[PDB]
């Protein structure tokens, strides 16, 4: 039973992001994708039970997938795509993890922002990984190995 996990996700994620910096002609998006905003002070938030807090994340997360598919959606068999691919796979494991935990699938929700920038999704992932994730599964937090 691992916490190998979040620690491992993060970096696996960042590795993805890096590999993008150098694909062929890399450019924005036709259509804005919505990814889960970059909330900033987790005040009101870490006061609240470990359950709602989890839902939000599974909430955001499912949205994150949607954004990301939304973005694979958009383009052809290209290198970002093929990566948004491997990313989306990644995002997927959390999704499990959190579905696993609350033992239901919630629908996408919580405040997002529109991003043409294909990084701002790689980003968005890591932001919950570093924030709302870590900040969850510290404090007791029966999270998912």
């Amino acid at each position, epitope marked *: 039973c691992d916490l190998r996990v979040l620690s491992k996700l993060l970096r696996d994620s960042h590795v993805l992001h890096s590999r993008l910096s150098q694909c062929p002609e890399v450019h924005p998006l036709p259509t804005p994708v919505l990814l889960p905003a970059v909330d900033f002070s987790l005040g009101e938030w870490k006061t609240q039970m470990e359950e709602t807090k989890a839902q939000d994340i599974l909430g955001a997360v499912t949205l994150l*997938l949607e954004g990301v598919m939304a973005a694979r959606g958009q383009l052809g068999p290209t290198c970002l795509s093929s990566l948004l691919g491997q990313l989306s796979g990644q995002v997927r494991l959390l999704l499990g993890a959190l579905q696993s935990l609350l*033992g239901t699938q919630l629908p996408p929700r919580g405040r997002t922002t529109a991003h043409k920038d294909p990084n701002a999704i790689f980003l968005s992932f890591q932001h919950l990984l570093r924030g709302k994730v870590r900040f969850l599964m510290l404090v007791g937090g029966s999270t998912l190995c």
Partner: antibody
Amino acid sequence: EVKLEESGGGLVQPGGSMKLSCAASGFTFSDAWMDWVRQSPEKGLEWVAEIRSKVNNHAIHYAESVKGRFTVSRDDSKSSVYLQMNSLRAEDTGIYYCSGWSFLYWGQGTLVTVSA
Amino acid sequence: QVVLTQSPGIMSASPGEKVTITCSASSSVSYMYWFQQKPGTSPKLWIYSTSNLASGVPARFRGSGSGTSYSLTISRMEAEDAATYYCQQRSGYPRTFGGGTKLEIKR
């Protein structure tokens, strides 16, 4: 955009078998946990089985009433969930909804009647 | 195998009047979930997580409850709202619904 058409519904004489099919489109099917949820006017609204994504490794779950007789299965690969009703029963009768995310989308149901 | 018992079995409400429905869990749960259903039709997810309207739902529906007695409120009743409202508890397995509650509009 997200579309569930169950099919397969029928007259079954008691003791008889039936398979319900439920075909999804509109979404990442592979990603969704699925449920069969069945409705009658006497019984009413009573959940039937649940069947988790590959991510949560297809973990299966039935109502005690149905434990041992119905067999839920999917093919993530055909974007469809199934109910292989078995050893049926005049109560097993009613509208069978194949269902969404954790209950978030909902096909229109087949009528299914076991009866002599 | 928690038992959800939705308060009024059928009620009637006047256009623009306050509708308030109860559901009540045989044993404390994290969250209620509500679906609206309408004769002829599949049911649809109306609120989830005790109080988030599912995309689709008018902002007149206020989702509420906590622990063991929960409740769905229509601010000022419309005629679309006439339908049954089923609560469901995803507390464990089996999932579990309720009676239902037939709202009727009263023209």
